Design a protein around this ligand. Structure first.
Ligand code: CLA
Ligand code: CLA
Ligand code: CLA
Ligand code: CLA
Ligand code: CLA
Ligand code: CLA
Ligand code: CLA
Ligand code: CLA
Ligand SMILES: CCCCCCCCCCCCCCCCCC(=O)OC[C@H](CO[C@@H]1O[C@H](CO)[C@H](O)[C@H](O)[C@H]1O)OC(=O)CCCCCCCCCCCCCCCCC
Ligand SMILES: CC1=C(/C=C/C(C)=C/C=C/C(C)=C/C=C/C=C(C)/C=C/C=C(C)/C=C/C2=C(C)CCCC2(C)C)C(C)(C)CCC1
Ligand code: SF4
Ligand code: SF4
Lengths: 128, 79, 86, 119, 663, 218
């Protein structure tokens, strides 16, 4: 029973049979969020907090991918800079990753990257 | 400055001016970029408000529309 | 163009017809009053809006009512002389 | 120096208070001669007709302008009205409910929204 | 056929009257247009805030004013005008340095109190508010698309039953829902915004006002009183505690209506149905009227309490800030107050369904049953106040012109004095029961004299007459004895013809037009009272019981520095003030002809001018007038344009006088 | 009634039908206007009259013909003539192409005199106060034009006003079941006459449920 009930008006509604509801496989006690059906991850059917009951999934999957992609790079960046991989050019002797951000924004190379990320994200905003 | 008004002259009220610049040209340009973004978005919004809603989109536009699951609840919760 | 409406309270005065400066109103036969006649406004496209008909109507509240429509004005409803809209 | 922002002013002030206002006035007087000019307040514009017809094409707003819209079963309403009028019909009156309503719906106002003939 | 020159005025007179739009067919379109307009207006507000913050950051001296605020003066923005002297130096610049304007808004004290210390913080704030403007416009686009997507989802929508058409009424349930809106407004937008501002104060404002202290401990919530001695303003700890209390109260209140679930909270309809109300809450004009009537006490109390209990650092030390803020907010709240009545009249014209003739069930019905009694008693109280204020003022004027100051009728303001005495006893009992006493309340209670009594009677007269005109217009908007069909016509229309006695100024809009003059006059009285008492409390206390004192010791006397601004002796930094003074006098007088001279004269004049143009050699072969036919302004347009000129002149003539007198 | 052959005023220079009139700047503005109104009449004596466009005139003992820009001027001259016991005057509107439209004594009988075959145009069968409230006709055919409503609509809204004051006996409209209704429009069961039976049974179920719920604490 994908539908929340079976009726014609929501005063004489006949709720679906309890054993016949679809139910999420991740959270077994919750009904399946049908708005997620069709999207890639929509087989674990995990959406408690009901943030897809309110917001178009196109937005959330856009935000989910951007977070994951940006974290996959950031995790690699932190690991490599910590293991010690400073770029070939000089002026890149930040000694430690934790102080790399404040060091580089002082040097002047972070303002460049923030601009380059900014323009691509503004282009992303038009795309989204 | 040539002050006017009794109180400014009889109290010595002065208007200090910074000898520095305030904001550098780079900061003004950074503000102007986002001002231009506001400007483009506002022109688009003005166009959309001028033309208004198009109800006949269901005959030509793709997709099938969407009512968010909370919007349905708000519909059937009352008015 | 304005909107000149005639209501049932008309008693066939013919004063409204006589007061109209652009021949908007006319008398039609009827059976709702002792005069056996009521006013009609077949040509409100020529109604300038002077409301002389309302001044001339002697019923308790005017049996003829002129509703001004300024976002509707035509060349006849404005009395244009120096300029033609046709 | 405390100046050096006047380099921005010498371009922006003449621009936004002379070039933009003049271009805006010229564009406004040009827009005034479009057939679409002020289509939301000026009667008899083409776009107003297209918008009204587009609204009427929507399945929800088909019978939206009808003041009598709402009667779920108009046949039941008409039958009940006819039955109620039959018991109250005065003596040998020859007026039926159907033609009475038909002639009460048909009025004679030729000069109403006649501006729907140009665009 | 096509239009005439009056098309521009006709269109612009209802350019934002979205109910009068031609394509709009349903409440869905109206509500969505209104919502998008709200988003655009919020964007405009955010851009204005960012504008002020930028100009304080770039073309100003916040970094120097913050150091020595009492004698220093803030800068609004630079002056770049090619009309000034390219030689010498203007009176607005320190010789070769750039030209500047002194800010009289009060943003400097606002930012200083809020915790700003550096220009960089103001620049970042400007950037953030521009970002918020972008966000608001994008939200407008988002909501337009979501509603259009619901509309498109009606291409996959059917109830399989004839009841499917019921969905027509629920398409704009997002905007038109009331219980959810009330719950979330009163809870989040009020209470939690107050709580967040308490957090802001505790984290920044109080830390950046004194020596370093404990980690924002609960000792930051005090109950001192008012007017911290050093900065002559309210304690920031008191402000944080006040916002915390208001936030808690409003958060608790916000759980009242049934917002998200049908099992919690009571419905507003059921609340009204069992009370003396049950109004038509689906009217947008009614909601607008009753929220404009809510912003009016808020703005009036803002004007009163920014001055009486100054909340910003060194705000009382500025002789121009205190008057300018009060006058500005008094004018804003007067406009909102008359707006409430105007939209109540529009509600009665457009969005009110009434019973047949006698069903006295609606509140508007019961008001309309005895509307004549209301208007007659309002006229009586207005007449009494006018007669007995003007007559006593005339007595004082005559007896003081006749060298007899002791023959005046000076009613001691005993009732206001009793209220002040009770409040002062309460405050003194509060203070005496403190181990940290010797507090100050600035102008919360002020010396009240017979002049105060007479001015208060004049203000009550003005309020009574403004309410009289507005209430009469609202109650007779749907029909009076003179014109018993007024609800068949528009809210604003020219007249009902010269017959039936003559019917000039008969519409409800004409009642608003008449009432705006009285709103302006009452506001002028209030502002004159405040400014006169501000300039010299002693001279006001003694010589303000006769109107000649108001004419001489205030207007004629205090206008000396302003007229001397630019003359044949040099110029001051008040030159703009004097020039704007004269320009606003010209604007005020220019609107007299739109009010006194009426259309037909000018229509004949325009016909003569058009005759000339169609008779001039070259013009006639290029322009026959058939396209945009020049016509005299219509009657309602003429009244509105004259009202606009009069309002602009009366309002904008005052700030130059304030600046010349106080600065 | 036979319309005459009123020629365009720019092609009838120096006509014997023109009355002797002084001539002023008040005449119709050529070079900008092409629509002219013409009034013709037959007089008995050369009685002086006043032109509607300034200046006086003397009629002709036979036919007369005048040209004016506005119908109002022609009607004013017609009233002036009729005061002099001159009937049989006709007023024509000349189109730009020269088409002659017969306007004032439209059916040959003056509008103040009852003539058979006329029908009350723009007539409303009630007192002026009988018009429906503007608030009732919002977003209908008569959005801001309550005085244009047909009498059936006025009676319908009057009955609605009568009904929507007995609040306790009203029927609240059931809330639609959005989540489980609303399939694709191709997914319908047709049977339109059965759909009203489904309406009847569903509304009966709704009313029975409401009565059962009300009879719990009432
Ligand atoms: C101070 C108020 C004021 C002003 C300025 C005017 C102005 C005018 N009245 Mg008027 N009038 C007024 C009050 C006023 N009236 C009042 C209270 C009444 C009582 C009913 C009348 C009754 C009245 C009648 C009955 C008549 C006039 C007429 C006139 C016009 C003839 C004078 C003229 O053409 O000069 C030019 C106008 C000026 C204002 C002179 C100054 C022009 C400025 C300084 C120069 C240009 C500024 C510059 C271009 C800036 C550009 C604008 C900016 C946005 C860029 C003129 C438009 C007569 C008319 O129109 O006949 C021709 C006429 O018949 N008036
Ligand atoms: C910003 C990160 C982010 C975003 C936007 C999304 C977005 C999405 N996820 Mg996803 N996910 C994430 C991180 C994220 N994910 C992480 C880190 C995990 C690993 C645990 C998962 C595991 C996961 C599964 C297993 C599934 C999804 C699914 C989905 C989709 C529907 C769920 C929804 O509506 O939530 C979108 C909205 C949010 C995520 C907002 C949450 C923000 C809250 C307020 C933060 C709360 C956490 C907080 C940091 C912890 C507090 C700290 C302390 C107090 C304890 C949607 C596209 C489902 C799917 O594929 O559907 C198509 C699905 O089955 N996600
Ligand atoms: C989340 C992504 C991310 C971020 C924000 C950073 C941030 C930083 N890295 Mg880094 N890094 C990352 C991922 C990331 N890293 C990964 C994945 C690797 C492994 C290959 C590294 C390897 C690395 C090294 C070896 C070093 C840094 C260093 C630095 C610091 C200085 C970089 C600099 O000056 O700009 C340099 C870059 C630019 C000026 C512009 C580059 C062009 C941009 C990044 C691409 C275009 C923008 C946009 C993303 C378009 C792509 C779209 C795409 C989705 C299709 C700075 C704190 C330096 C450091 O900390 O030591 C001093 C350093 O030496 N990084
Ligand atoms: C011929 C008369 C004239 C003209 C055309 C101007 C033109 C200008 N003045 Mg100006 N001014 C004048 C006389 C004049 N002034 C006089 C006599 C004084 C008194 C001494 C001043 C005092 C003055 C000050 C103090 C300031 C200006 C400013 C300005 C500029 C603002 C433009 C703007 O933002 O439009 C906007 C227009 C509107 C919002 C009006 C809409 C209706 C503009 C270039 C301002 C400036 O420099 O801006 C950068 C400014 O701060 N003027
Ligand atoms: C001060 C005036 C006032 C009055 C007369 C009522 C009266 C009522 N409230 Mg109420 N309420 C109030 C203030 C008030 N409330 C405030 C300030 C809040 C916010 C905390 C609430 C939040 C609230 C909720 C959440 C609910 C009620 C409910 C009720 C009803 C049941 C009473 C009950 O069980 O309470 C003991 C009753 C008609 C209940 C009800 O019947 O709703 C259907 C319900 O669910 N009220
Ligand atoms: C017989 C005389 C008479 C009486 C008994 C009243 C009685 C009343 N008038 Mg009133 N009135 C009168 C004459 C009178 N009026 C005249 C002549 C005018 C025209 C100026 C008005 C104009 C007027 C207004 C505009 C208002 C009233 C109002 C009222 C009521 C409140 C009291 C008030 O405002 O008084 C104050 C009265 C005045 C300010 C008017 C001046 C009084 C006149 C000059 C007295 C004339 C008396 C007459 C000469 C006696 C001759 C006797 C002799 C022939 C034997 C009250 C019912 C008010 C109301 O309706 O509130 C309930 C209100 O708003 N009256
Ligand atoms: C000096 C200017 C002036 C004065 C003295 C008045 C006086 C009055 N106006 Mg008035 N008014 C004015 C200008 C003025 N108006 C202007 C410019 C407008 C804009 C069109 C209006 C619009 C207006 C409206 C719309 C209304 C009034 C009303 C009133 C009366 C208020 C009751 C009162 O105080 O009676 C006391 C009487 C006097 C003080 C006059 C002196 C009597 C002798 C000398 C003593 C009063 C007759 C109201 C009214 O009728 O109240 C009943 C009302 O409804 N006025
Ligand atoms: C229409 C009548 C009217 C109105 C609207 C006002 C309005 C106002 N008065 Mg006021 N006053 C009035 C008549 C009125 N007064 C009369 C007749 C007197 C006696 C001379 C006073 C004496 C008075 C004093 C001493 C003070 C005020 C103050 C105030 C202000 C504060 C409200 C207040 O406490 O008033 C009190 C409420 C009333 C007076 C309402 C009474 C209304 C009745 C009908 C008036 C007629 C009464 C009658 C003459 C009594 C005769 C007695 C006799 C039989 C022995 C407010 C603006 C105070 C103020 O502004 O301080 C800053 C203040 O201190 N009033
Ligand atoms: C300092 C400034 C403060 C002074 C501003 C105060 C003005 C009061 C605000 C009142 C505005 C609401 C009233 C209004 O819009 O309707 C006032 C009237 C309303 O217009 C009337 O509407 C009626 C239907 O309700 C009928 O259609 C009438 O024919 C039509 O005239 O508007 C006009 O007449 C506008 C004519 C002048 C337009 C000037 C364009 C302005 C361009 C510069 C910007
Ligand atoms: C490329 C670039 C650049 C350039 C830039 C620019 C060119 C800028 C400009 C800018 C600008 C030039 C800006 C402007 C702006 C404006 C604005 C921002 C305004 C706004 C407004 C609003 C927002 C409002 C609106 C509205 C209205 C009023 C109407 C109705 C509707 C609405 C509400 C929408 C540089 C090199 C530097 C740097 C790099 C990048
Ligand atoms: S004046 Fe009035 S009552 Fe007389 S005929 Fe004309 S409409 Fe009828
Ligand atoms: S308003 Fe004037 S022109 Fe129009 S019908 Fe009445 S009298 Fe005739």
């Amino acid at each position: 029973x994908x539908x929340x009930x079976x009726x014609x008006x929501x005063x004489x509604x006949x709720x679906x049979x309890x054993x016949x509801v679809k139910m999420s496989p991740s959270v077994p006690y919750l009904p399946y969020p049908e708005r997620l059906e069709g999207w890639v991850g929509g087989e674990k059917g995990f959406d408690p907090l009901r943030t897809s009951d309110i917001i178009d999934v196109y937005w959330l999957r856009e935000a989910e991918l951007k977070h994951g992609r940006i974290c996959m790079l950031a995790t690699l960046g932190w690991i490599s800079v910590d293991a010690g991989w400073r770029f070939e050019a000089e002026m890149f002797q930040g000694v430690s990753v934790i102080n790399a951000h404040n060091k580089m924004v002082e040097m002047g190379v972070m303002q460049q990257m923030l601009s380059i990320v900014g323009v691509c994200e503004i282009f992303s905003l038009y795309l989204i | 400055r040539v002050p006017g008004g009794k109180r400014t002259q009889e109290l010595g009220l002065v208007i200090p001016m910074a000898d520095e610049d305030g904001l550098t040209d780079g900061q003004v340009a950074g503000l102007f970029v986002i001002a231009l973004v506001v400007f483009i978005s506002a022109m688009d919004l003005a166009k959309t408000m001028y033309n208004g809603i198009n109800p006949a989109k269901f005959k030509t536009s793709k997709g099938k529309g969407y009512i968010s699951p909370l919007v349905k609840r708000y519909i059937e919760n009352g008015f | 163009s304005h909107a000149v409406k005639i209501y049932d309270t008309c008693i066939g005065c013919t004063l409204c017809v006589r007061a109209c400066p652009t021949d908007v109103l006319e008398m039609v036969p009827a059976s709702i009053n002792a005069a056996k006649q009521v006013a009609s406004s077949p040509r409100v496209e020529d109604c300038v809006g002077c409301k002389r008909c309302e001044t001339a109507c002697p019923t308790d509240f005017l049996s003829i009512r002129v509703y001004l429509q300024d976002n509707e004005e035509t060349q006849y409803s404005l009395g244009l002389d120096l300029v033609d809209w046709s | 120096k405390y100046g050096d922002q006047r380099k921005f002013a010498a371009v922006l002030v003449p621009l936004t208070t002379l070039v933009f206002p003049a271009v805006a006035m010229g564009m406004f007087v040009l827009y005034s001669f479009q057939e679409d000019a002020f289509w939301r307040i000026v009667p008899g514009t083409k776009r107003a007709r297209e918008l009204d017809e587009a609204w009427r094409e929507h399945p929800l707003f088909a019978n939206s302008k009808d003041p009598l819209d709402g009667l779920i079963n108009p046949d039941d309403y008409e039958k009940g009205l006819e039955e109620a009028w039959e018991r109250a019909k005065p003596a040998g009156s020859t007026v039926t409910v159907k033609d009475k309503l038909k002639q009460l719906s048909k009025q004679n106002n030729p000069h109403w929204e006649s501006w729907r003939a140009m665009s | 056929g096509r239009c005439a020159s009056s098309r521009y005025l006709q269109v612009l007179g209802s350019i934002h009257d979205i109910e009068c739009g031609f394509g709009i067919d349903n409440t869905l379109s109206l509500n969505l247009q209104i919502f998008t307009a709200h988003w655009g207006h919020l964007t405009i507000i955010l851009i204005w805030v960012s504008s002020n913050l930028y100009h304080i950051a770039s073309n100003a001296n916040y970094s120097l004013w913050v150091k020595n605020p009492i004698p220093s003066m803030p800068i609004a923005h630079n002056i770049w005008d090619p009309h000034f002297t390219n030689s010498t130096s203007t009176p607005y610049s320190h010789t070769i340095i750039t030209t500047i304007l002194i800010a009289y808004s009060g943003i400097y004290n606002q930012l200083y109190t809020s915790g700003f210390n550096t220009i960089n913080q103001i620049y970042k704030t400007t950037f953030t508010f521009s970002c918020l403007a972008v966000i608001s416009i994008l939200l407008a686009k988002i909501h337009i698309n979501t509603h259009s997507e619901l509309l498109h989802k009606l291409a996959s929508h059917t109830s399989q039953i004839p009841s499917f058409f019921q969905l027509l009424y629920f398409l704009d349930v997002a905007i038109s829902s009331v219980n959810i809106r009330f719950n979330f407004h009163t809870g989040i937008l009020v209470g939690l915004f107050s709580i967040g501002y308490t957090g802001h104060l505790l984290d920044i404002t109080i830390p950046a006002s004194r020596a370093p202290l404990i980690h924002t401990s609960p000792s930051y919530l005090t109950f001192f009183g008012g007017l911290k001695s050093n900065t002559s303003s309210l304690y920031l700890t008191d402000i944080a505690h006040h916002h915390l209390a208001i936030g808690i109260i409003s958060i608790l209140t916000g759980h009242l209506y049934s917002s998200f679930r049908a099992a919690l909270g009571t419905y507003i309809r059921d609340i009204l149905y069992t009370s003396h109300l049950t109004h038509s809450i689906k009217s947008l004009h009614l909601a607008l009227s009753l929220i404009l009537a809510s912003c009016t006490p808020l703005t009036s109390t803002t004007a009163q309490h920014i001055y009486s209990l100054t909340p910003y650092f060194y705000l009382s030390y500025d002789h121009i800030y205190s008057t300018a803020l009060y006058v500005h907010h008094s004018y804003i709240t007067s406009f909102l107050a008359i707006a409430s009545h105007a939209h109540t009249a529009i509600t009665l014209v457009r969005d009110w369904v009434a019973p047949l003739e006698q069903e006295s069930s609606s509140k508007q019905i019961r008001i309309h049953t005895h509307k004549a009694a209301i208007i007659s008693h309002l006229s009586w109280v207005s007449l009494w106040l006018g007669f007995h204020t003007l007559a006593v003022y005339s007595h004082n004027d005559t007896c003081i012109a006749f060298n007899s100051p002791s023959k005046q009728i000076l009613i001691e303001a005993s009732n206001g004095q009793l209220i002040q005495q009770a409040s002062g006893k309460a405050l003194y009992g509060t203070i005496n029961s403190i181990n940290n006493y010797n507090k100050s309340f600035d102008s919360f209670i002020h010396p009240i004299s017979p002049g105060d009594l007479y001015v208060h009677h004049a203000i009550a007269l003005g309020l009574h007459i403004t309410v009289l005109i507005l209430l009469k217009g609202g109650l007779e908007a749907r029909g009076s004895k003179l014109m018993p069909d007024k609800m068949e016509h528009s809210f604003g229309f020219s007249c009902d013809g010269p017959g039936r006695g003559g019917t000039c100024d008969i519409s409800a809009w004409d009642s608003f037009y008449l009432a705006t003059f009285w709103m302006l006059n009452s506001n002028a009285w209030i502002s004159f009272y405040f400014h006169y008492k501000h300039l010299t409390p002693r001279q006001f206390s003694e010589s303000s019981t006769y109107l000649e004192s108001w004419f001489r010791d205030y207007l004629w006397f205090n206008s000396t520095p302003l007229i001397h601004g630019y003359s044949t002796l040099g110029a001051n930094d008040l030159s703009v003030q004097s020039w704007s003074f004269l320009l606003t006098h010209l604007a005020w007088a220019s609107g007299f002809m739109f009010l006194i001279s009426w259309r037909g004269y000018w229509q004949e004049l325009i016909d003569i001018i058009l005759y000339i143009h169609l008779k001039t050699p070259i013009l006639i072969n290029l322009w026959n007038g058939d396209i945009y036919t020049p016509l005299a302004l219509s009657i309602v347009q003429a009244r509105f344009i004259g009202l606009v000129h009069f309002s602009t002149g009366l309002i904008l003539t005052y700030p130059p006088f304030i600046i010349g007198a106080t600065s | 009634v036979v319309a005459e052959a009123i020629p365009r005023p720019e092609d009838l220079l120096d006509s014997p039908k023109f009355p002797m009139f002084e001539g002023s700047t008040g005449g119709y503005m050529s070079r900008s206007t092409r629509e002219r109104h013409a009034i013709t009449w037959t007089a008995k004596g050369q009685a002086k009259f006043e032109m509607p466009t300034g200046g006086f005139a003397i009629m002709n003992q036979g036919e007369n013909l005048c040209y004016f820009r506005k119908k109002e001027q022609c009607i004013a001259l017609g009233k002036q003539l009729r005061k002099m016991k001159i009937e049989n005057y006709k007023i024509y509107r000349l189109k730009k192409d020269g088409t002659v439209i017969f306007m004032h004594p439209a059916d040959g009988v003056f509008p103040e005199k009852v003539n058979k075959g006329r029908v009350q145009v723009n007539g409303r069968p009630f007192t002026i106060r009988g018009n429906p409230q503007q608030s009732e006709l919002k977003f209908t055919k008569y959005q801001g034009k309550g005085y244009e409503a047909d009498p059936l609509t006025t009676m319908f809204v009057k009955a609605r006003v009568m009904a929507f004051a007995d609040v306790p006996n009203l029927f609240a409209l059931p809330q639609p079941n959005m989540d489980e209704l609303v399939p694709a429009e191709e997914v319908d069961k047709y049977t339109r006459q059965e759909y009203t039976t489904r309406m009847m049974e569903a509304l009966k179920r709704v009313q029975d449920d409401r009565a059962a719920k009300a009879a719990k604490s009432l």
